[PDB]
């Protein structure tokens, strides 16, 4: 196997909440050193294809990430003599997601069983996106809705991504006039999340 190193972004979840965020450095294929670390105590774990993999995190680097400062992680390992290098910074040429909550089709309403709400986030430049649902003012658990992976959409011009999410609800709840909301978390949103709310009265 070829020795290869790569960096991973901080958790969007952590960054949008406005709390501490871990930047991860892994050797997919020992001690690491970091350029932007100014007394940031790095932490390692047990090394586990299952063919030569080690990990090292760096906490409290949310502030510099959002500033657009570049992160370097070099790894000195005993197999080779000289280290490897990997570069990662917060992405440029950002576009805010366009969010649409589409009501249930006529077909499902007529059958008066479960009806399907479809959330579409579209046109956002970094692939990374959170999708969450409300019924009323209650946030629904993750396992009560299906969210697809964020995929690159077609264009000759700029690179944008789209994601879809689907919440099944009782036709009863929809016909009572209950509210349903999809909340889309994304780096380019100045209010961190965008909310769209829908009911039978629109």
């Amino acid at each position: 196997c070829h020795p290869r190193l790569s960096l991973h972004r901080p958790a969007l979840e952590d960054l949008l909440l406005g709390s501490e965020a871990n930047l991860t450095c892994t050797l997919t294929g020992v001690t690491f050193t970091w350029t932007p670390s100014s007394g940031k105590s790095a932490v390692q774990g047990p090394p586990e294809c299952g063919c030569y993999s080690v990990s090292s995190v760096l906490p409290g680097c949310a502030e510099p990430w959002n500033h657009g400062k570049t992160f370097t992680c070099t790894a000195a390992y005993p197999e080779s003599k000289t280290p490897l290098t990997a570069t990662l910074s917060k992405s440029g040429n950002t576009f805010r997601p366009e969010v649409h909550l589409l009501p249930p089709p006529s077909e499902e309403l007529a059958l008066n069983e479960l009806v399907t709400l479809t959330c579409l986030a579209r046109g956002f430049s970094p692939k990374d996106v959170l999708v969450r649902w409300l019924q009323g003012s209650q946030e629904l658990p993750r396992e009560k809705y299906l969210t697809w992976a964020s995929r690159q959409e077609p264009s000759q011009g700029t690179t944008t991504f789209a994601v879809t999410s689907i919440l099944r609800v009782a036709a009863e709840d929809w016909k009572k006039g209950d509210t349903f909301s999809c909340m889309v978390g994304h780096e380019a949103l100045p209010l961190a999340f965008t909310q769209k709310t829908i009911d039978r009265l629109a």
Partner: antibody
Framework: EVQLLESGGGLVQPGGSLRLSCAAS????????MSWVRQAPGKGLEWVSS????????YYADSVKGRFTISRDNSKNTLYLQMNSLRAEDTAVYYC???????????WGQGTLVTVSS | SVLTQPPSVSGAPGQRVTISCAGT?????????VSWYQQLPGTAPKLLIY???IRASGVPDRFSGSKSGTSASLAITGLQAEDEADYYC??????????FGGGTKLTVLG
């Protein structure tokens, strides 16, 4: 247990500014719809501001639009109400409240009295 | 605006009493997000009823809620002296406002 502690209430001159704080504990104030509800002495409950889950998507009573600002520092787990251009008719007890499943104020704080006077 | 409640309702011990809450198509009409609060003197409001009918933790079944078109009613049976309080209805409006009623003072006679 869910607990909400309002602070910052006191005297403020007409036209002056004042920031109220609301220390949440036993729940994450980010993970819920959070509101300010005010009650002038003797008179009724008046909903003031809301901030929806996770983000900065805020709504305001028209009596308060343009003057007040609801905010939420997740690292302190505290809700805020910034109040500017204050008038005699803003004199009230200000409660923060956790909204549950159905736009229902399930948990309230003790309140903080803001007095607007010369 | 404000949801219209009767400013005052009175009752004898052990009797059934009702408090109306007249709203609109934008709030109580065609939705179920109506809640009722009890305010004893010098204390914060306490949720009694949410979702029109659903009774909060600890609240006795003496308290019941209902809806008909653009108005809701709190109903108290086996009325007792310790039910003397200010009762507020609230509803979600289409603004993404929460609208309170004017409040009702409940007096218990004799």
């Amino acid at each position: 247990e869910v607990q909400l502690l309002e602070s910052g209430g006191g005297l403020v001159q007409p036209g002056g500014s004042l920031r109220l704080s609301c220390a949440a504990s036993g729940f994450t104030s980010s993970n819920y719809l959070m509101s300010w509800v005010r009650q002038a002495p003797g008179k009724g409950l008046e909903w003031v501001s809301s901030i929806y889950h996770y983000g900065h998507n805020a709504y305001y009573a028209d009596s308060v639009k343009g003057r007040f600002t609801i905010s939420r520092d997740n690292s302190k787990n505290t809700l805020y109400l910034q109040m500017n251009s204050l008038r005699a008719e803003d004199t009230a007890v200000y409660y923060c409240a956790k909204v549950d499943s159905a736009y229902d104020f399930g948990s309230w704080g003790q309140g903080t009295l803001v007095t607007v006077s010369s | 605006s404000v949801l219209t409640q009767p400013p005052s309702v009175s009752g004898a011990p052990g009797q059934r009493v009702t408090i109306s809450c007249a709203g609109t198509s934008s709030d109580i009409g065609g939705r179920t997000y109506v809640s009722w609060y009890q305010q004893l003197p010098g204390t914060a409001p306490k949720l009694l009823i949410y979702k029109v009918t659903i009774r909060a933790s600890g609240v006795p079944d003496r308290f019941s809620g209902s809806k008909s078109g653009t108005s809701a009613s709190l109903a108290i049976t086996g009325l007792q002296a310790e039910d003397e309080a200010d009762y507020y209805c609230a509803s979600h409006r289409s603004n993404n406002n929460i609208v309170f009623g004017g409040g009702t003072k409940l007096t218990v006679l004799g």
